[PDB]
Amino acid sequence: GWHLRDTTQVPSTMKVMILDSGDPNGPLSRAVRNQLRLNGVELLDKETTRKDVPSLRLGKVSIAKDTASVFRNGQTAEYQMIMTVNATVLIPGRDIYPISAKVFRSFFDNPQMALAKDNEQDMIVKEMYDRAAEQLIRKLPSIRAADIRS
Amino acid sequence: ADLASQCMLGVPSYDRPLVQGDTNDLPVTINADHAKGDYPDDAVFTGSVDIMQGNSRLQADEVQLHQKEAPGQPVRTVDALGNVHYDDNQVILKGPKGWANLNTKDTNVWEGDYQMVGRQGRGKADLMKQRGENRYTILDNGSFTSCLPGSDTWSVVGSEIIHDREEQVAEIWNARFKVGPVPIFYSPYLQLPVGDKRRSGFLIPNAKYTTTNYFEFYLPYYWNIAPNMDATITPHYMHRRGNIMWENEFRYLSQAGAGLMELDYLPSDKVYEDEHPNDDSSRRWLFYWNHSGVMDQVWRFNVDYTKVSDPSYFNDFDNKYGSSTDGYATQKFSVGYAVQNFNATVSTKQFQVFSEQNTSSYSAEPQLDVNYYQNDVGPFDTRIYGQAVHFVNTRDDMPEATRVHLEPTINLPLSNNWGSINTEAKFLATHYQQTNLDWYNSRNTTKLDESVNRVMPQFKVDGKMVFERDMEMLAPGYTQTLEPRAQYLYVPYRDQSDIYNYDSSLLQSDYSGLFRDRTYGGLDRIASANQVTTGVTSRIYDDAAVERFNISVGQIYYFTESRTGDDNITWENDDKTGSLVWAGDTYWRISERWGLRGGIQYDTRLDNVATSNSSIEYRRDEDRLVQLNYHYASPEYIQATLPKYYSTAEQYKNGISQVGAVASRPIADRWSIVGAYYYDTNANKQADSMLGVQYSSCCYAIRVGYERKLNGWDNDKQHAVYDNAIGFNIELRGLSSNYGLGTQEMLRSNILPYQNTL
Ligand SMILES: CCCCCCCCOCCOCCOCCOCCO
Ligand SMILES: CCCCCCCCOCCOCCOCCOCCO
Ligand SMILES: CCCCCCCCOCCOCCOCCOCCO
């Protein structure tokens, strides 16, 4: 009973919105803005005079690096990166809906390659922001549906 | 009921209407039995005296209002001569006598006592004073506690106590700390971190016993240095080492953002002296600096910096800014400028490697990264990346390099509701100047070249479709998606064997990783690619459109071998082309409290799973949870991705098969019990074990804890070395907002810390 998706990833009432955070030039804001743009969303300033426009506000990312597993001498084998993002979607008339993303990625340590490993970490982190942005977008339909229901 | 509400039972009131704005011109109600005197300038009231203005309510036997000299502007003085009771939205005061200046807000109450309103704390003094427009509370011969009325648990007394509301700190002269009526500690002068906006109650001395140090104790001393800076100075006695580790922490807030420094210094060490008899000194030390901030939305500053006296430091000393699981310390500085279409960042990256096989490490000194983006050119998006870096070794006999790189990219994104495609063309151009090659080239068949150019085009095309169907059969309103995804990637072969590999490590490929266009990080090795990646994700959404489930599986099919021209990787077989690499991932939120996750990475060239992970978790709340988890990495994977000696050495070569279990349960709303166990199934040995118990009340909390962990390796007996620690800690509660039972903190305390998996 498979049919091509006939609906937009982003709900119709969200096809125009305000993006807002305290780090508009940071990588999270870039990843999110980019995902919104690829989904056909028009982004406006918070100063805009168009009313009834939903606002996506991004909180600050947390990024943790934990030892996931150790070798037999107690040295880290695998590291786990965890990225967490809190956000809100304000639908101006109705209510304020919190959403979040959580991203796990891991890599193996190499003290002989430390510089290389550092670069690997940068790469991984850069990708996680993208994942986080995607997660947030995929939570939009649940917002739209939660607003209709109430 | 929970701890917070139980505690709020003992925190008084604040009835009466809350007034917004000032108290200045607001009406003044005055009831008494008599008023003598000339009303505006001199008034003496008496009997049953009750006065109300704004949020304040004064009540006493006799109240005297006055005005005065120093012609100026108008001088207003109030006096209260018996059974004085003052009331507002902040504090309740009581005492035999009182005084105030309504202009300056400065106040006195003699032989009085105070109790906070809306929060914990109370105390008494021979003289209570408000100064500096309610900035400063001064207690002459005073006491304070956060204990509820009727509870004598603890208090602090001093000949003089001065609390600063703005800085959130109390100075105490002749401080004595009391448990019940019995003082257990005296200090001539102390500063404590105390205020309504404080996130932690002020610290008290504590102790522990360890395999490493035997008996240890610490004396935290808070020092508020200046505005936006403070420090903590903590002598830490470690018995086995026969000296004091002086721990120093410095915290600051600046316009460039927030930071912390730590300098821990141990002047001599008996254990280290015995293990290194011929050495110049036994001193041990740590310096740590962390800074992050974004200034004016544009400048981004970062420091992550750790330097220790020697490789055994984190095996010997408490793991806070470092861990005994660390293989090296990182030293990193960066400054960067970022606006919407542009960024540039300059940085330094250095490393201090612990183990001795080679402690040699390459550094980036400095590195410059630039990105420029332009989205609008026709249907195309464009960007350019460039980098300049200078690589230097810690050894003097090793190649040094400068490397410059340019990577222009153009792509055409295209999208439907059901479908997406993206085409991308890119050029990679890199230039190396390598020097100090003489030593390297005498020891190696394959020669490094002084001048190297690597130029090569890349083509990549990506596509995705989303199919949907209803699942009524599963549950009403459930939706299922099928999302096939495919990629073709072409990069031509370039022989890179004359380029030293400074910054490039082999990347792990999980499901998302499959679609990455690089085999290595960094720029020194770029694998040839002729390949097609294919995968599919399926998702299940509930009636509320919340994704409850997903699974994904993919592979990479190689039409030709992936080559850098220097290929050192030890695989288990000769497989070149076909589907070499597979990966899969799954997530299921079963219910509100239950979830599971898993992932697997498989490579045919290993004849085995590369790595895999699994977990399942029950969580009712922050205090009640159970988690099981598993991590696997094959011996083949270790042999393929890690230096040769890891594959021959016992502490490494078996790879990872690691099961762990973590659980916490609360009791009677005041108790928290927590445990974790981590077990290597290959060796049938414990990796890590931890237990903790905490009791939390309104005015304090006590935690006993225990950990046994792998601390190192003994090269003679060829077995693991373990460390055991057991400790007590007492904290003061009611000094901040925290009503927690300390579950999360304890879950984070061990070397394999807890992470919520849903
Ligand atoms: C004559 C009545 C005194 C006026 C009371 C002023 C209270 C405003 O500040 C309340 C918050 O500060 C807590 C006070 O701590 C108790 C010691 O100060 C009492 C002043 O004599
Ligand atoms: C690699 C760069 C790391 C930056 C080093 C830390 C910067 C030191 O701070 C000095 C600048 O701070 C100026 C303070 O300005 C006064 C107001 O700020 C205090 C409240 O934010
Ligand atoms: C790397 C260290 C950076 C630390 C920043 C220090 C900048 C200090 O600026 C403080 C400015 O704040 C003024 C407020 O002062 C409050 C109390 O002073 C009143 C006089 O008692």
Ligand SMILES: CCCCCCCCOCCOCCOCCOCCO
């Ligand atoms: C191991 C998967 C268990 C999934 C149960 C989630 C269903 C939500 O309501 C169930 C409430 O009961 C909780 C399950 O009882 C625990 C015993 O089963 C767990 C096996 O260790």
Ligand SMILES: CCCCCCCCOCCOCCOCCOCCO
């Ligand atoms: C679902 C189980 C997860 C928790 C397992 C934790 C097991 C760790 O306990 C090890 C017990 O070993 C005894 C420790 O030796 C004495 C110290 O115990 C005193 C407790 O503070």
Ligand SMILES: CCCCCCCCOCCOCCOCCOCCO
């Ligand atoms: C020798 C006694 C072992 C029995 C202890 C109770 C069970 C604890 O082990 C459970 C895990 O079993 C090992 C699973 O092995 C992981 C697969 O990889 C190993 C390849 O040989």
Ligand SMILES: CCCCCCCCCCCC[N+](C)(C)[O-]
């Ligand atoms: C490499 C052996 C030399 C060790 C001597 C001590 C070095 C510690 C330097 C700390 C200063 C770091 N900082 C902030 C200036 O960059």
Ligand SMILES: CCCCCCCCCCCC[N+](C)(C)[O-]
């Ligand atoms: C636009 C580029 C198209 C790339 C699609 C390539 C399809 C390859 C199919 C997998 C391998 C086919 N083979 C060789 C096994 O028969």
Ligand SMILES: CCCCCCCCCCCC[N+](C)(C)[O-]
């Ligand atoms: C499964 C990769 C290596 C793990 C080692 C032993 C754990 C067995 C777990 C089996 C579960 C596999 N699967 C596909 C059902 O998830």
Ligand SMILES: CCCCCCCCCCCC[N+](C)(C)[O-]
């Ligand atoms: C320690 C000196 C106390 C002097 C009295 C001033 C009252 C301040 C109370 C600080 C406690 C803040 N609180 C209740 C939120 O934790």
